[PDB]
Structure formats: C-alpha cells, structure tokens
Symmetry: C2
Subunit: 395 residues, 2 copies
C-alpha cells in the first residue's frame, strides 16, 4: 500500500499539489520530440517565478524530480517557458521536461494516467527545487485516490495546498436565475442538465459543441444550487464534530454521484434532441451486461428478424485508459463497438489494441486535436456518430 502511505505523507506536509491526467502530448505520444508536461500558467508564478518573463527566449530552471510511483533514479527536470510568441514565433506555454530516460512521465503508454506532482514550496520565495511525483500505474491505484477526492476528468488541472486537494472535498467557487422551486427543493441531475441545455447554451446547434458548453453550464448551476441548500444548514452550525463531518460526507457523495452520471445524461439528451429516438440505456443483452447505449432498441437487438450488422452500442468511458476491454463482452451480436471518451488522446499502441478489438472511438470534435495524427484520422465526432445512426434507423 505504497500509494496510500504516499498520499498520507503528502496530505500533511508542506506540499503544493498538482493533479492531472497525462495527455498524449504530455507523454510525447503525439510523436516527435518530447516537449514536456504542461503546467498551468496560474501556477508558474508561485513555483517558478524566475522563468515567468519574456526578457529572453525560453527561460528555464532546474529542480530535482523524485518519482515515488516507479523505480526511477532522481533526475534534474527542467521547468521551461516556451516563449517564442514574444520572439517572432508562436509558443506561449510553460512545461516541465527532461525527466530522464525511461521515466514514466516520458512513456507514451502512460497516456491517460492520473498523475500527481507534489511540489515542495521554497522557503525563501524562490523557485521550487524539488517535486515528488506519482504516476498511477494502474486502475487499482487510481481507485485509491479517486474514491476519496472524486474521479479526475481528462483536461482537469487541479492544484492547491496538499491538504485541501487530497482532503476529500474540493474547494473553489466563483461562477444565473434559478427557478423559484430550486430555492426549496434540490433538483435532480437531469433537471439541472435539461435547464442548462434548454436555458443557456443555444449558441451552437452542433452536438459536440453543445455537450462541452452544457457541461460547463451544468457545473456552474449545480454549484449555485448546491450553495443555496448547503449554506442554509451550514449557517446554523452543528452540535458535534461528527455531525459536521457527516454532512460533509453527505455533500461529497452527492457531488460524486452527480459527476458520475453527468456525461451519460448529457448524451441521452443530445441523442433525443437530435432526432435519434431509437435507443435503450437500461437494456440487457446477454446474461446481465447492459451496455450504456444500445441502438436502435432492446427489442431490435433480441429480434431474430432484425439485421445484426445494423445494431450498435455506445459505451461511455470519460477516461478509457485501462477501462475499455470490459466493453467487448457487453453485446455478443455487435462486433463493431463504439466507445465515447473525453480523454485527451491515446497512444498509437493503445489505439492499435482498441482497433484490433473492433473498437471505434467517438470523441468530442474539439478533443480530436489532442490525439496523435494517425489516430485522429479515424476518430468520429459526436455529430457524425449521431448522423450515422440517424439513417440506419431512418425506417
């Protein structure tokens, strides 16, 4: 239980933690020369203040990178500010690179992996000189941390003091007219989603774009609805510490449960809204598998008269890394299965494994740029997947 102990160590020491899932580009999976692990600009001024300027092209500094997740020698990694936008070119991003040969952070097969970089604050206002990292090597490890703090979505850039980041509940509340009744009752996930779609996006008739915009709106109104209801109880206080913790746990489970059901609820709504009215979500196939989405219906799937080559299923895996093979056993009849994912890319080798198993990836349009070229070319946008189905069942 090394990871567990590592988490306990970090959570109570002076560390500034940054959590993210490795993108195809982070690992060099998108090909070419390694550019490094992306770091949020809003974190550079705190950790590497000396490279946060445009006086010279590509300023950088070194820091010792200790990897606790894999048996790797410590190395002098390089935090760097790709500055060329201020020197006649185009770059404008900060990254940490040169992890050393064989390092998990430079391994394309770790694309999609949940990674935690615990930076040691410099007691002098200077640049951070050491980072302790953990690249989750399996789903078992990821379950350890995500069970407590929640699942980390691809693209998420989480950072803050270790204690608050690893505590269980996530801080941060910044960004509407909520219906009267929401001030009295706590709306369901579907209700929030139907309100987000029906009341705020509408600036895009494209499914891929609608999904991303509505996901952003859902996040904000849930936060507002949550704030209303929680602020009320919270203001009255509690009789004991454990009545206090019990509520925190209640609040935490609600967020986790809703975060987990969100994506599938949005897709269900979009399929309906775009004319694709032929599909089952609570549909059993063989034994007790039940794929996330089955087209055109549970009935047609079990129908001896209905053509098999016209059946389709769509498994939804926010993060598909090591969480996709369990889909090949969900529909005996369907040999070409579709997988919807929000992952910021997959390696060529990962994709080859998928291709060989008859898996076809459906990815939100704007996320395609995150995939290696060879893989990108075979991706399906959400809009195209909907179109393909909205034709096969035209009758």
């Amino acid at each position: 239980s090394v990871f567990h102990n590592w988490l306990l160590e970090i959570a109570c020491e002076n560390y500034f933690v940054y959590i993210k899932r490795l993108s195809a580009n982070d690992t060099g999976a998108t090909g070419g020369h390694q550019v490094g692990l992306y770091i949020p600009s809003g974190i550079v001024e705190k950790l590497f203040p000396s490279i946060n300027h445009t006086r010279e092209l590509n300023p950088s500094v070194f820091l010792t990178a200790h990897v606790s997740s894999h048996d790797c020698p410590d190395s002098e990694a390089r935090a760097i500010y790709y500055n060329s936008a201020h020197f006649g070119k185009t770059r404008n991003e900060k990254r940490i690179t040169r992890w050393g040969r064989g390092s998990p952070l430079q391994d394309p097969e770790n694309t999609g992996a949940l990674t935690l970089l615990a930076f040691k604050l410099d007691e002098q206002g200077g640049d951070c000189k050491e980072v302790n990292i953990w690249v989750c090597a399996s789903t078992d490890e990821e379950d350890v941390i995500e069970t407590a703090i929640g699942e980390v979505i691809p693209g998420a850039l989480i950072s803050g003091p270790a204690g608050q980041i690893l505590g269980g509940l996530s801080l941060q509340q910044a960004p509407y007219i909520l219906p009267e009744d929401w001030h009295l009752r706590f709306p369901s996930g579907s209700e929030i989603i139907q309100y987000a779609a029906s009341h705020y996006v509408k600036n895009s008739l494209d499914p891929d774009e609608q999904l991303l915009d509505r996901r952003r709106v859902e996040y904000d109104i849930f936060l507002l609805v949550e704030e209303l209801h929680v602020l009320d109880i919270i203001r009255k206080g509690f009789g004991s510490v454990d009545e206090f913790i019990a509520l925190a746990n209640s609040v935490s489970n609600r967020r986790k449960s809703r975060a987990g059901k969100s994506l599938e609820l949005h897709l269900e709504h979009l399929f309906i809204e775009h004319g694709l009215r032929h599909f089952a979500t609570q549909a059993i196939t063989e034994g007790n598998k039940k794929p996330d989405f089955l087209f055109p219906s549970a009935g047609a799937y079990h129908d001896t008269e209905f053509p098999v080559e016209n059946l389709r299923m769509l498994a939804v895996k926010t993060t598909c890394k090591d969480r996709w093979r369990q889909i090949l056993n969900e529909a005996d009849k369907i040999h070409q299965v579709h997988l919807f994912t929000l992952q910021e890319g997959v390696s060529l080798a990962q994709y080859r494994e998928m291709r060989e198993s008859g898996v076809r990836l459906v990815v939100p349009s704007s996320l395609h740029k995150k995939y290696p070229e060879a893989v990108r070319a075979e991706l399906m946008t959400l809009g195209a997947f909907i179109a393909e189905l909205t034709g096969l069942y035209a009758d």
Copy 2:
C-alpha cells in the same frame, strides 16, 4: 474498479453500513457468524423483537459483491430464551451460508462491509450487500476514505455519512482530562500526545490503556480547537469545506506512528534501554550489535503485510486462522500479542503466543 463503483452506489442508495475487520470467531477459525451488535440487528429487523414465541426470526437475502457467490438466504433471529425459562436475550444474524467469504477462515483479519438496504417505510431489512476485501489494494481504497480500521473497531451508520472521503468516528469525548494550557491554541503532535499519555494518565494492560488515553486526548484536543467554530456555523461553503478536509486529514494521520511510539515508552520504562529505530522500526540489543539479536516489527493488522519484514512481529489483530499462522511460524515470524487478545486466536495458536510481558522479560538481558 468494481469496489470503487460499489462504494459510491452504497453511499447514495438508502443503506445502513457496518464495517469491521473479521475476527477469528466471525470467520470460524476458532459456524455462528460475524459479530454484529444486537442493538443494530434489533433496529434492522423490528418485527422479530417480541416474545409471542421462542427464537422468532425472518429471512433476508444476502448478496455477496466482493466475490462471485450466489444469493444465499441468511436469517435474523431473536434468541428469546430469557422469556422462556432460560437466559438468552439478544438479536443476531446467522446462516450466512457455508462457502461464503464471511465463513472462510482465510479471510481472517480482512476488512469487511455489510450494506443493509433500508426500508423508508419502516419494515424489516430484506437485503444485505456484502463486501469482504480480498486484498490490501481493496482495503487501501476504503481506508484512504474513512481512515484506518483498527482490529476490533466497529463503524456503522447511514452509508452516505460514513462513506464520502472524510473520516468519521463515533466515540464520545471524555472531558475528564486536564491538559497543558497551550494545547488549546497549539495542536500537539502525535508523539507529544503519546508522551503525555505515557507520563500521566504487565505492560500488556498499559499499552492498550495508554492507547485509549491517547485517542481520548486527541478527540478532546480536537473539540477544544473546532467545536465552538462548528457550533457557531459557517458563512460560506468553502469555509465549511476547508475545515472538514483539515479535521479529516488530521484524523487519518493519527494512525501513523502511534504503536511504534507507545511501545518505545513501555520499553525505556521497563529496563530495555538502548535500541534502534533505524539503521526497520525496531532492533535489539542495539544498532551497534549489527557490525548472532532480536528484530521486532509492528503491524496493527497483520494479514497480508508481514512478509516484507523478512528482509518478532507485534500485532493487535483479533486472531489469525490456523493456516495463516503456519506460513508465519515458518520464514521466522514470532508473534507478540497483548494478553487480553490471546483469547481471540485459535484454540491452538493461543498457547504459542508471546505476550508483551514475556517479550520484555526475555529481551531483558
């Protein structure tokens, strides 16, 4: 993956959860079934709490989720004796079925959770979801969330209040302790609390006694620091959250070097002076005698985490099956368990255990 999703499923579906580590008696390594406070069973099956007849009972479906076993039918029975000439008056659950993870002596010391599905109307529980951790990897998942589960500890209540990521506890605060005045403003370190407990309020009884004093002091200190704030209320979600996370993290950290410290004091105090806590948590007679010896490792829970030591073993586990011990008797593992705990081990390994006293006595010299 499945456990990860199971936990969230249970947390949000009207369940009552009961968590504890399986003792030797719960498993049978010494088949009645896991111990469950009669009080809890009584609330879970209110229809059996009568004396209209002897040992009245009801069946409930036992679904095993941690393993692939078929839905057996267990029963909640109110042992009524006392009201029929004898002396039994306690509600229990039995017949978990044979071949069930709960009735497997090899799962001794394993963390287990029982999720009883509740009826919002008020009727008897008719279903119980079972999860017996089959690896430390699974135990890490749940313990990272609720905190380390000490052998003998019992955790239960609404699943959505227990699970979720923050560490809840159920013991009441003991205000009978007089503490240093600065501790109201400065939270003392674990060691500071243990040293205090070792200087104020057979070592076999002491360790386990300072162990409880330390826990009470920590809880009292915690109350002095946050109760008043908590009673006042919060002005924002994030202030509530920031304190919840901090309160919880400090709790989860407590179960770090508690045992390796309480023992240390009990040694210096009982002759055993010079020793080493690093070259290996312990060493006898000293680090110098390492350049022919006794190396004692400490593990609150022994199951699946002793092998690394092979390159004496003090534990607080409520028993170890016959087979489990064999593998340990070999390799070179000599157990050390507090007297009050031997009665927990198999009616065979018991007489082979070396109490904390018998250990201190021997090493002395």
